[PDB]
Design an enzyme around this catalytic site. Structure first.
Site, short mmCIF file in Angstrom:
data_model
loop_
_atom_site.label_atom_id
_atom_site.label_comp_id
_atom_site.label_asym_id
_atom_site.label_seq_id
_atom_site.Cartn_x
_atom_site.Cartn_y
_atom_site.Cartn_z
N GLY A 13 55.54 31.08 20.64
CA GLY A 13 56.48 31.67 21.57
C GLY A 13 57.70 32.27 20.90
O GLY A 13 58.80 32.22 21.48
N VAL A 14 57.55 32.82 19.70
CA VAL A 14 58.65 33.51 19.04
C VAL A 14 58.58 35.01 19.25
O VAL A 14 59.52 35.73 18.87
CB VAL A 14 58.66 33.17 17.54
CG1 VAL A 14 58.95 31.69 17.35
CG2 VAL A 14 57.35 33.53 16.89
N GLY A 15 57.52 35.49 19.87
CA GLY A 15 57.40 36.88 20.24
C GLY A 15 56.34 37.68 19.50
O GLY A 15 56.45 38.91 19.45
N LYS A 16 55.32 37.02 18.93
CA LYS A 16 54.30 37.73 18.14
C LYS A 16 53.68 38.87 18.94
O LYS A 16 53.53 39.99 18.43
CB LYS A 16 53.21 36.76 17.68
CG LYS A 16 53.70 35.67 16.71
CD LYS A 16 52.57 34.79 16.21
CE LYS A 16 51.95 34.01 17.34
NZ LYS A 16 52.92 33.06 17.92
N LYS A 38 43.06 39.90 18.88
CA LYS A 38 43.43 38.51 19.11
C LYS A 38 42.13 37.74 19.25
O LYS A 38 41.51 37.77 20.33
CB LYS A 38 44.30 38.34 20.36
CG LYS A 38 44.64 36.88 20.62
CD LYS A 38 46.04 36.70 21.19
CE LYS A 38 46.43 35.23 21.22
NZ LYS A 38 47.76 35.01 20.60
N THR A 42 44.15 31.60 24.74
CA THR A 42 44.17 30.36 25.52
C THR A 42 45.00 30.58 26.79
O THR A 42 45.49 31.67 27.07
CB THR A 42 44.72 29.19 24.69
OG1 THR A 42 46.13 29.37 24.47
CG2 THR A 42 44.01 29.10 23.35
N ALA A 199 66.25 41.08 23.58
CA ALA A 199 65.78 40.04 24.49
C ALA A 199 65.28 40.64 25.80
O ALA A 199 65.90 41.55 26.36
CB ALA A 199 66.91 39.03 24.75
N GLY A 200 64.16 40.12 26.28
CA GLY A 200 63.60 40.60 27.53
C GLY A 200 62.79 41.87 27.44
O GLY A 200 62.40 42.41 28.48
N1 LIG Z 1 50.02 25.56 18.34
C1 LIG Z 1 50.10 25.65 19.71
N2 LIG Z 1 50.31 24.55 20.46
C2 LIG Z 1 50.39 24.59 21.82
N3 LIG Z 1 50.26 25.72 22.54
C3 LIG Z 1 50.03 26.91 21.92
C4 LIG Z 1 49.93 26.94 20.44
N4 LIG Z 1 49.71 28.22 20.11
C5 LIG Z 1 49.67 28.96 21.24
N5 LIG Z 1 49.86 28.19 22.32
C6 LIG Z 1 49.85 28.71 23.71
O1 LIG Z 1 49.78 30.14 23.65
C7 LIG Z 1 50.91 30.73 24.32
C8 LIG Z 1 51.37 31.99 23.62
O2 LIG Z 1 51.65 31.63 22.28
P1 LIG Z 1 51.89 32.80 21.21
O3 LIG Z 1 50.94 33.92 21.53
O4 LIG Z 1 51.83 32.16 19.85
O5 LIG Z 1 53.39 33.30 21.57
P2 LIG Z 1 54.05 34.68 21.03
O6 LIG Z 1 52.95 35.71 21.12
O7 LIG Z 1 55.22 34.97 21.94
O8 LIG Z 1 54.49 34.33 19.64
C9 LIG Z 1 51.97 29.64 24.32
O9 LIG Z 1 52.88 29.78 25.41
C10 LIG Z 1 51.14 28.37 24.43
O10 LIG Z 1 50.77 28.12 25.79
MG LIG Z 2 51.21 35.82 21.56
#
Ligand SMILES: Nc1ncnc2c1ncn2[C@@H]1O[C@H](COP(=O)(O)OP(=O)(O)O)[C@@H](O)[C@H]1O
Ligand SMILES: [Mg+2]
Ligand SMILES: Nc1ncnc2c1ncn2[C@@H]1O[C@H](COP(=O)(O)OP(=O)(O)O)[C@@H](O)[C@H]1O
Ligand SMILES: [Mg+2]
Lengths: 226, 227
Positions: A13-16, A38, A42, A199-200
């Site tokens: 959840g850092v924004g990938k 991807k 999940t 942000a956002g």
């Molecule tokens: N290591 C992990 N543990 C638990 N949940 C995860 C993990 N990796 C991904 N998720 C799930 O996938 C969702 C999106 O994560 P991710 O795609 O990594 O975020 P972003 O794309 O913003 O960096 C998360 O909100 C979480 O529900």
């Molecule tokens: Mg992601």
């Protein structure tokens, strides 16, 4: 082949995904053909779909994936809950290999941090990057703890000679503040900060997201990616 | 010499201080002489003082500070804001070496995570662990992302041949829940979980903190830390 870039991050959840979309949009606007992979999605019960986000914000059509688990957990725990194994290492590697072509920027998103299990058994986004000879874009926060996590993630990349393409700040607060500003200056001293997405930005419509995305990266660094 | 443990973490605010206080209490209750050591302390303008919490919670009197900064920031930034430099590498090593004594367990708390800069230039708690030949106890969460941060911290320790003495979950909820249960199960497949301190351990009075501490660690592990 072309240019393959794994977009990893300091954590979940850092924004990938928005960073993939943002770089995908910038590339496409520079005339570069873009693919995004991807392999494992999940949280599909509640409707998570990082590929659809990229297709909606950047307009990418080449969007490849192998597996979708309902539970919003890490890939390995969601697969364990579902009773069905993650994909295999070869499956992911071959999928990315076959997307790759000259003139193409191919982006790859795993899940969470660099070391979360992405395939059976225990194979990570690092192992995938090594196998397809991808460099690594590292998406970070500008918040508490980001330097420690950024440095640990860079060490793990370099340990397997996965090249660091740069950092992106997934969510740049407004106004910055004393912590975000201080943290950005310090990341700027350990790797190039390619962009800081406001942000956002993940909720902008595609027109605004494209405009925002072309202002967020440096036009020349994007052009030279392929 | 004695036994020196660095107590590091996957980040800031995971409970390194309460784990020091808990391991100190358990070691004291095994008759082991304990010193606790905090080379770099930030946020004094907010009243932060980790040595004092350890003294309050565990009764430790052998408490050694060195660098103190008003602002609650990363040490580099806090010292910058205060017009000071971080201490040098040799001053942190001197602080620790002076405490080391046979039959003594000396706990060294950093600031935030393993690669947080504690001494100019870019010198970390891992560098310090190397200089004093200390093992490293890693304090973790049972929260989202713990596995990745824990694996990255463990890999960076092994990269410099710093031995790992285990994990402690610094905050463990009652009851656990599916997320924390899942994470503790997974963390325990990758290293030894030495303890999981019940959340809110910092509000226990002296008597209950010592009961918690004696039950939280395996006495045989505690006693085997110190010859
Ligand atoms: N290591 C992990 N543990 C638990 N949940 C995860 C993990 N990796 C991904 N998720 C799930 O996938 C969702 C999106 O994560 P991710 O795609 O990594 O975020 P972003 O794309 O913003 O960096 C998360 O909100 C979480 O529900
Ligand atoms: Mg992601
Ligand atoms: N790298 C850092 N960045 C920002 N703040 C920090 C850092 N390291 C320590 N701090 C400050 O020190 C306080 C306690 O940190 P720490 O002692 O690492 O937590 P714990 O002992 O609970 O693991 C925090 O509230 C924070 O303000
Ligand atoms: Mg502390």
């Amino acid at each position: 082949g072309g240019t393959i870039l794994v977009v990893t991050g300091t954590g979940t959840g850092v924004g990938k995904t928005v960073v993939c979309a943002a770089l995908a949009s910038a590339a496409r606007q520079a005339g570069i053909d873009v693919a995004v992979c991807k392999p494992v999605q999940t949280g599909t019960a509640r409707g998570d779909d990082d590929l659809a986000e990229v297709g909606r914000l950047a307009g990418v059509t080449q969007l490849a994936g192998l597996a979708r688990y309902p539970q919003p957990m890490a890939p390995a725990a969601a697969a364990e809950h579902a009773g069905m194994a993650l994909p295999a290492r070869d499956q992911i590697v071959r999928l990315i290999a076959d997307l790759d072509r000259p003139g193409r920027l191919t982006l790859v998103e795993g899940a969470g941090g660099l070391l979360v299990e992405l395939a059976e058994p225990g194979v990570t986004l690092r192992d995938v990057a090594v196998d397809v000879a991808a460099a690594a874009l590292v998406v970070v926060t500008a918040d508490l703890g980001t330097l420690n996590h950024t440095k640990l993630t860079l060490e793990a990349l370099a340990a397997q000679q996965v090249s660091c393409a740069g950092l992106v700040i997934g969510s740049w607060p407004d106004p910055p503040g004393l912590v975000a500003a201080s943290n950005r200056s310090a990341l700027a001293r350990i790797a190039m900060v390619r962009a800081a997405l406001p942000a956002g930005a993940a909720s902008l419509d595609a027109g605004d997201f494209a405009a925002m995305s072309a202002a967020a990266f440096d036009r020349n660094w994007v052009a030279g990616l392929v």
